[PDB]
Amino acid sequence: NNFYSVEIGDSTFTVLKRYQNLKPIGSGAQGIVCAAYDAILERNVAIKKLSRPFQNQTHAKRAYRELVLMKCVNHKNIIGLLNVFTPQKSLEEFQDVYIVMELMDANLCQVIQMELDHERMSYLLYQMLCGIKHLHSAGIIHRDLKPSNIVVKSDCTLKILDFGLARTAGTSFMMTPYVVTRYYRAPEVILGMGYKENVDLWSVGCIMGEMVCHKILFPGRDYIDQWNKVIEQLGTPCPEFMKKLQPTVRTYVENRPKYAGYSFEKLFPDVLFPADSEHNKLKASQARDLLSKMLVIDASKRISVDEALQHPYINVWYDPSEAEAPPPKIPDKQLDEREHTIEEWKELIYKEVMD
């Protein structure tokens, strides 16, 4: 018919005949991502394949959630949907879902490792914050930003790939050998506290500090050891913070070995930053000042997305059409709250694919 199959390694991609010359570009928790040439659009696209998402309740929840958001969210700094199809003809035969999205050049692992100047470092962080603020205007808190799900293009544009974890999603998604999620997990999530919208700035602080140090800031050996790596660097938090913790978590945190931490001048010395740009705001001290406001254990004392966009290191590139863009209207008011059975998820996802 109008479909054809191509063997990509061990995965089998049954894509539309319009998508030719499929080539692998990355491996994720949901499956393999391929780059193709859309002969109809005469442009390069990216295709990822979801295999029986409904069969897993958590994957069904994410697949539907991300299908809904991918459609209605249109923004310069969030990856854009181009097509959605399934090769199966009926609801009973329904199996796989293919998402066609804008094709980017690489992920942040190539940019974090290379040596950047202040102009590109701040502009990439600005593009990140614009995407985060747009997601927040729709009521989505990402809580899962890491170099692996942030992609860039050779013209220095940045886009967020996924929409993170919901409130009920948990600490992590399915397995992948190319990512360690706990490194960028925020203290609120670690210690079982509630999380606010500024939880995403902790991820940004870890990513920004990684652009400067060229190594993982907080490399925990296990889930609860991640807290040790955080306090060893930033210092044991104040008693004001620990009072908000649940009893058992508080008992653990109180009886941890006390660490005084290091000042951000010792954590991020001037030598680790590039030469001070010709712009007055793009100084090594300004980038360190932004880090001192993001990498903060107490979310109550951490700055917000709007405050970071007004920070002198970021405010250089402020454009209201990018930061104060009109928020997207999500059609499903119970996007994250709905619970269904495996066959109810199957029919719910199938309808999103077909219209």
């Binding site: 690489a106 190539q110 940019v111 290379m114 102009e119 590109r120 502009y123 860039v152 293009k153 050779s154 013209d155 220095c156 740009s277 010709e278 712009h279 250089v316 590139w317």
Partner: peptide, 9 residues
Amino acid sequence: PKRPTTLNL
């Protein structure tokens, strides 16, 4: 200043 227009690799 103007936004950067190139990012190698």
